[PDB]
Amino acid sequence: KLFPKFSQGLAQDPTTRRIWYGLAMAHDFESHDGMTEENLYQKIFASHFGQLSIIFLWTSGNLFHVAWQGNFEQWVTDPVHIRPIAHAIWDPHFGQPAVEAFTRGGASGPVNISTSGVYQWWYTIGMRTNQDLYVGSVFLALVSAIFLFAGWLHLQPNFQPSLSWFKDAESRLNHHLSGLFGVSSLAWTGHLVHVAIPESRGQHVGWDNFLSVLPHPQGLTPFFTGNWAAYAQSPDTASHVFGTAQGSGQAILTFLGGFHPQTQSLWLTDMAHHHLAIAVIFIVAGHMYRTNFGIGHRMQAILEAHTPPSGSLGAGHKGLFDTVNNSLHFQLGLALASVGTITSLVAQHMYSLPPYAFQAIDFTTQAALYTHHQYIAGFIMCGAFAHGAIFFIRDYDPEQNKGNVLARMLDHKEALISHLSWVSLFLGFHTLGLYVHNDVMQAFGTPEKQILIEPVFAQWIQAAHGKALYGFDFLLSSKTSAAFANGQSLWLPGWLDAINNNQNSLFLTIGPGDFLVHHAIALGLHTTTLILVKGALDARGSKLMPDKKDFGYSFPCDGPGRGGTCDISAYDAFYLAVFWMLNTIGWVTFYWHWKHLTLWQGNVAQFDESSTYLMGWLRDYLWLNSSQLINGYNPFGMNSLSVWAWTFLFGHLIYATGFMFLISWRGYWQELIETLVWAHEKTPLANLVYWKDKPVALSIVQARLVGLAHFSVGYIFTYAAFLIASTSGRF
């Protein structure tokens, strides 16, 4: 009766879905009772403080458990033959072989081998002792408490901001380019130059001597003079032992390319020059805008003047500032699109260009980080389109958007959905056709009749980047071109000696299996956008339901009439796209994991012969590498992979349980729950015990969300157990 304090209509619900929807539309602030736009913005501001405080508390917990139950100081001495430690295990349910099986890494109690990569990230930014990590945990715990105080105090009425303060898009986009991105990257270069560079050279720079230890031996005179090349005179040698001064080097802002020869990682000197350069460019781009000083540029004038005539984009970008600034789901959709793309960018560029010392030797760390940020990017990219669909129902106004790009998008929505349908249908037809063709050829003992289309277009890009394996000799693999010649002192030879190494992940050599699986990835991307764009554009209406905007974003159906309207809502079209999203990210991580397993084992031909046909994916990757996984426990005993043997089944159990909410739908279950209500209300001495919420079955939208949640959790837990065990068992 009380628990949805935000929803007085849910508070009058005598059933048990009062609890389930009090938990589920609690953060849909716009649908709360008595909500105004000012209280909306105030609750969102406090919510962002809560998210920041949780992120800092989480990082401080990582730091504290590494400093306390980990072997970071032991890992610094030997980062190749020592496994990292996440946290100790206190499980009273263990037996003695389980206690003795999880003791490794040089510890005494049972421990977990961390695959989050945090030792490689902390060791390259200057952490060497546990006392450097306790200070970080205490600092981030203090900053998390400060953000909890801030989220409490900016809700207090002397400190509650106005409605007009949140709609200052001009000042926010000024300050979050100049200050939050440029000054922060300049300060991170200040951390790299002052702390990470001398600690990589073996000189301790802590909080006691950073005002007394020069980063450069003639420091701040070449910056004020003009000869900035003095900051790049002596880099680290090719015999540099990391963390010591054996062939150290003295430069702070070098520009080399390629990798450190020991750590197989990016040099910290040109990572410093990287963050310094993009700090300068972010400061220049952040003094572009006109807030309160007369000079700059205005968001109200640039938008409604970029309109091309003669029916090119219609009325162009006329009327967007009334709808970008007023809508939060449009801003959240653009923000999620940007974050989900640059998260895929983080994932693609942290395996090929590993930024951290002794990363890409720890293979399980690399697989976990890639698969982690790729699923994070897949969920964030499907939520970009989800909030883009919430925009068209809740926020879109056609009379405010007369003729702009956002109305022309809805005007030819059928052309968009039909062309995405064509591209997805073409890609699936021919990708499945060539895979089934190669399977039929492998079955009949004739591998030569396979369609093995060579990836010509991407081998040309590798050869234009300097990979001399294919002989296209176009720009950087040609020794006579101008793009080759005008960078031989600047950044090229380390990059050319790093590509042509066939043992890093920097531009792997590719063949017909990589053709087929990049077209599988294109199938997945175009089909996921087919489902998401079709859900965003038909969110307001269709010929089956011309008033879909009248029912809102999430609703079950419109009944059995008009042929039947199961899954008609835009929520239910996000819903079906999460399956194709998990499919797509599963394809990219199957492909990443198996090409890297065959790379790390040595036999890239074992991939190149088997990845051309789906039986080779089934038995040379799934069947083959899940041996030591499933042998985590057996009647002979158990080992340290048994926790991944359990979770691999645990993920198989949640996944199938999702199908119970997916295949069986509500109304079978309400009829079962009514017989259970009968049995409880007619049982002797159980009549005394009576509920407060009337038991009903889960609603239709709720059944979708619960089945999708179990599907995704079982999907992620199965592949995480398989990935970690399959990599860290043989390595």
Partner 1 sequence: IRHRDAIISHLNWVCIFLGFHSFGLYIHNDTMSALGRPQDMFSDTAIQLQPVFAQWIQNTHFLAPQLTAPNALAATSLTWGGDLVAVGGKVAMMPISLGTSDFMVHH
Partner 2 sequence: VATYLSNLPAYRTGVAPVLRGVEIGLAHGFLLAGPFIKLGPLRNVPETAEIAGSLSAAGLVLILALCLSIYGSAQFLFSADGWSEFAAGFLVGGEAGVAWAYVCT
Partner 3 sequence: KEVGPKRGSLVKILRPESYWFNQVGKVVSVDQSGVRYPVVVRFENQNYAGVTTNNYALDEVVAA
Ligand X SMILES: CC1=C(/C=C/C(C)=C/C=C/C(C)=C/C=C/C=C(C)/C=C/C=C(C)/C=C/C2=C(C)CCCC2(C)C)C(C)(C)CCC1
Chain residues that interact with partner 3, rule: CB under 8 A: 543-544, 546-547, 561-563
Closest CA to 431 of 512, 530, 510, 375: 512
Q: Of the two residues 104 and 680, which places its CB atom closer to partner 2 in the complex?
A: 680
The binder of partner 1 chosen from 11, 339, 649, 662 (CB under 8 A): 649
**Binding of ligand X by 539 (CB under 6 A):** no
| CB-based contacts of 304, cutoff 8 Å, min separation 6 | 317, 318, 319, 320, 321
Contact in structure between 719 and 656 (CB atoms under 8 Å): no
Q: Of the two residues 682 and 692, which places its CB atom closer to partner 2 in the complex?
A: 692
Phi and psi angles of residue 653, each rounded to the nearest 5 degrees, phi first: -85, -35
- Directed axis angle between helix 700-728 and helix 642-662, to 10°? 160
Q: Segment 636-655, which members bind ligand CLA (CB under 6 A)?
A: 653
Q: How far is the C-alpha of 102 from the C-alpha of 455, rounded, in Å? A: 45
168 binds, among ligand X, partner 3, ligand CLA, none (CB under 5 to 8 A by kind): ligand CLA
546 binds, among partner 3, partner 2, ligand X, none (CB under 5 to 8 A by kind): partner 3
Q: Of the two residues 102 and 119, which places its CB atom closer to partner 1 in the complex?
A: 102
Burial level of 472, CB count in 10 A (0-12/13-18/19+)? middle
Query: Which segment (87-95, 137-145, 234-242, 525-533) binds partner 1 by CB under 8 A?
Result: 87-95
| CB-based contacts of 240, cutoff 8 Å, min separation 6 | 246, 247, 248, 249, 260, 261, 262
The binder of partner 2 chosen from 2, 305, 482, 685 (CB under 8 A): 685
358 binds, among ligand X, ligand CLA, partner 3, none (CB under 5 to 8 A by kind): none
**Structural tokens at position 133:** 């990590």
**Binding of partner 1 by 667 (CB under 8 A):** no
457 binds, among ligand CLA, partner 3, partner 2, none (CB under 5 to 8 A by kind): ligand CLA
> Could you tell me the smallest distance in angstroms from the CB atom of residue 491 to partner 3?
59
Contact in structure between 423 and 526 (CB atoms under 8 Å): yes
Q: How far is the C-alpha of 664 from the C-alpha of 666, rounded, in Å? A: 7
689 binds, among partner 3, partner 2, partner 1, none (CB under 5 to 8 A by kind): partner 2
**Binding of partner 1 by 669 (CB under 8 A):** no
Closest CA to 453 of 426, 472, 434: 434
> Could you tell me the smallest distance in angstroms from the CB atom of residue 685 to partner 2?
5
For 544, how many CA atoms within 13 A lie in the half-sphere containing its CB? 15
Burial level of 669, CB count in 10 A (0-12/13-18/19+)? middle
193 binds, among partner 2, partner 1, ligand CLA, none (CB under 5 to 8 A by kind): ligand CLA
Q: Segment 303-342, which members bind ligand CLA (CB under 6 A)?
A: 332, 336
**Binding of partner 1 by 142 (CB under 8 A):** no
333 binds, among partner 3, ligand X, partner 1, none (CB under 5 to 8 A by kind): ligand X
**Binding of ligand X by 429 (CB under 6 A):** yes
633: DSSP letter: E
**Structural tokens at position 525:** 């991307």
Task: Please count the other Cβ atoms lying within 10 Å of the Cβ belonging to residue 498.
Answer: 20
**Binding of partner 1 by 670 (CB under 8 A):** no
The binder of partner 2 chosen from 690, 699, 720, 724 (CB under 8 A): 690
Query: Which segment (15-23, 167-175, 638-646, 685-693) binds partner 1 by CB under 8 A?
Result: 638-646
Query: Which segment (128-136, 521-529, 636-644, 683-691) binds partner 2 by CB under 8 A?
Result: 683-691
Contact in structure between 163 and 37 (CB atoms under 8 Å): yes
| CB-based contacts of 180, cutoff 8 Å, min separation 6 | none
> Could you tell me the smallest distance in angstroms from the CB atom of residue 177 to ligand CLA?
9
Size of the site for ligand CLA (CB under 6 A): 84
Contact in structure between 367 and 723 (CB atoms under 8 Å): yes
Q: Segment 99-118, which members bind partner 1 (CB under 8 A)?
A: 99-101
Q: How far is the C-alpha of 619 from the C-alpha of 621, rounded, in Å? A: 6
Largest CA distance in the chain: 94
**Binding of ligand CLA by 601 (CB under 6 A):** no
**Binding of partner 2 by 2 (CB under 8 A):** no
Q: Of the two residues 94 and 555, which places its CB atom closer to partner 1 in the complex?
A: 94
Which position has the token pair 């946290």?
87
Closest CA to 215 of 248, 250, 245: 250
Instruction: Give bridge partners of residue 88 from the DSSP assignment.
Output: 111
Closest CA to 708 of 653, 669, 657: 657
Query: Which segment (42-50, 459-467, 688-696, 702-710) binds partner 2 by CB under 8 A?
Result: 688-696
Q: Of the two residues 341 and 631, which places its CB atom closer to ligand X in the complex?
A: 341
> Could you tell me the smallest distance in angstroms from the CB atom of residue 546 to partner 3?
4
Catalog residues that contact partner 1 under the rule CB under 8 A: 91, 93-101, 632-635, 637-638, 642-643, 645-646, 649, 672, 674-676, 678-679
